[PDB]
């Protein structure tokens, strides 16, 4: 967006020496076929386990029984003959 100087104008570009025209043109680089080499193993001996863990520990229980329940020799009360 330059302003044209009317007192000192200039013309378009003139030819100048050039950079040997084939040396600015590249070759198209020619890929050969390739292979991810080797026979891959199916599994890996991992350093960490792959499953979930638990944040807190919960107390577990198992039921037990008591035993054969016996009789008893109670201390027996007195007879309510109007004193009680």
């Amino acid at each position: 967006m330059a302003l044209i100087n009317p007192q000192f104008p200039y013309a378009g570009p003139v030819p100048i020496p050039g950079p040997a025209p084939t040396e600015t043109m590249p070759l198209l680089n020619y890929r050969v076929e390739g292979r991810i080499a080797g026979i891959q193993q199916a599994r890996q001996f991992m350093p960490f386990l792959q499953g979930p863990h638990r944040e807190v520990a919960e107390q577990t229980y198992y039921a037990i029984g008591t035993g054969i329940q016996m009789g008893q020799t109670f201390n027996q009360p007195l007879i309510n003959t109007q004193e009680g």
């Binding site: 201390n75 027996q76 009360p77 007195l78 004193e83 009680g84």
Partner: protein
């Protein structure tokens, strides 16, 4: 914690088995108890 009522569980007594008894030896027994008319 559990008073001797001895009306709701039999006739409880207090036992002293002595080893040596001199002449005119006695056993003094102090008591402390509740009493009402239930």
């Amino acid at each position: 914690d559990k008073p001797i009522y001895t009306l709701q569980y039999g006739n409880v007594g207090f036992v002293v088995n002595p080893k040596t008894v001199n002449q005119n030896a006695r056993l003094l027994m102090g008591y402390e108890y509740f009493t009402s008319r239930t």
